[PDB]
Design a protein around this ligand. Structure first.
Ligand SMILES: CC(=O)N1CCC[C@@H](C(N)=O)C1
Ligand SMILES: CC(=O)N1CCC[C@@H](C(N)=O)C1
Ligand SMILES: [Cl-]
Ligand SMILES: [Mg+2]
Ligand SMILES: [Mg+2]
Ligand SMILES: [Mg+2]
Ligand SMILES: [Mg+2]
Lengths: 194, 194
């Protein structure tokens, strides 16, 4: 019933652009929506986000997260490891690559979501959510080597999966951080399950 | 270590703007970032709310109430938690219960309310509160719920069992062209992983 008629470029940067989208509403009435898009998409989605399950025997299972300064937020955020998919890269490969660069961990793919939207009222940004296990007892993950790209400055924070939401709330209460909505949602459902 | 040096408007629409953010990196080097922000945020603790609406009924499995809407940024239909922007002076809880009633017809009860969480912190400053709400589907108020859509709102309600949420979303995605929201997928994934 609803569909895009046209788009009008308002402003284009190097990495983001702002458009005015004209669309048909289900009554037959024409309407406008201010939308953001990345300039970098060519493949399945803009980015991957990695749910990294760190498994060590005789230890609680942890979810590995990253803390970074985020210029659009003006502050530090706690997030799933993540990045944009390179031209000609698969989402699985992007996930394992980003996880290694941001955490130094080498993991195995468990599952891969379809393209899911980040903020569909605002942008067309999509990611693949990629669940990865990390065998923390394997020699390669003994002393994990984070390989930042130029301009990345990433702290690794591993939290127990069993208490994830309480631990995130605690970091927020002490550290003045912002938790990512996908991280929080996952933490919530861990608590809400069964 | 890192902080914002300056924020330069690049282009301001009615609803969304693009800014050039100058910031200090942790090596002591000045860098820039293209950032998206809404123009609508006043004194609210966040831009918006998303509602995790748990529909409870005697002799029923618990459902998660979702909505399906055309999203002009995406050029297509998206399946999301019920959500909207917080009105000036409105609390996150009031916003959540109001949006839930507008979008689904259901009259909920507050369970919990997250801190402000970031939507896509590498792109925008946008934040939500994620508000968990239970819906007593045995109350006569919630018997034959009618959405009260606002001007230009066109919302379908989809309630799926919590105990099968990821597979049921996968089956909706296999049947038509639509995108599941990343927070919904994240929460469906945790329900599997727990
Ligand atoms: C409620 C909302 O998100 N609004 C109103 C309609 C236009 C939208 C836009 N231009 O992006 C903003
Ligand atoms: C790695 C990446 O996606 N970057 C490059 C640095 C500038 C950033 C921006 N302009 O939003 C985007
Ligand atoms: Cl797993
Ligand atoms: Mg990253
Ligand atoms: Mg990276
Ligand atoms: Mg809405
Ligand atoms: Mg609404």
């Amino acid at each position: 019933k609803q569909y895009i008629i046209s788009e009008e470029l308002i402003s284009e940067g190097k990495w983001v652009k702002l458009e005015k989208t004209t669309y048909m509403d289900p009554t037959g009435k024409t309407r406008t929506w201010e939308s953001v898009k990345r300039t970098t998409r060519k493949q399945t989605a803009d980015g991957v986000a990695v749910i990294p399950v760190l498994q060590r025997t005789l230890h609680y299972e942890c979810i590995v997260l990253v803390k970074q300064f985020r210029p659009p937020m003006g502050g530090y955020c706690i997030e799933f490891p993540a990045g944009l998919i390179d031209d000609g890269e698969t989402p699985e490969a992007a996930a394992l690559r980003e996880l290694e660069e941001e955490t130094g961990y080498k993991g195995d793919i468990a599952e891969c979501s379809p393209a899911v939207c980040m903020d569909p009222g605002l942008s067309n940004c999509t990611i693949h959510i990629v669940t990865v296990t990390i065998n923390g007892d394997d020699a390669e993950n003994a002393r994990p080597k984070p390989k930042p790209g130029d301009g990345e400055f990433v702290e690794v924070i591993s939290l127990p999966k069993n208490d994830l939401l309480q631990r995130l709330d605690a970091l927020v209460a002490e550290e003045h951080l912002t938790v990512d909505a996908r991280v929080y949602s996952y933490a919530l459902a861990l608590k809400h399950a069964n």
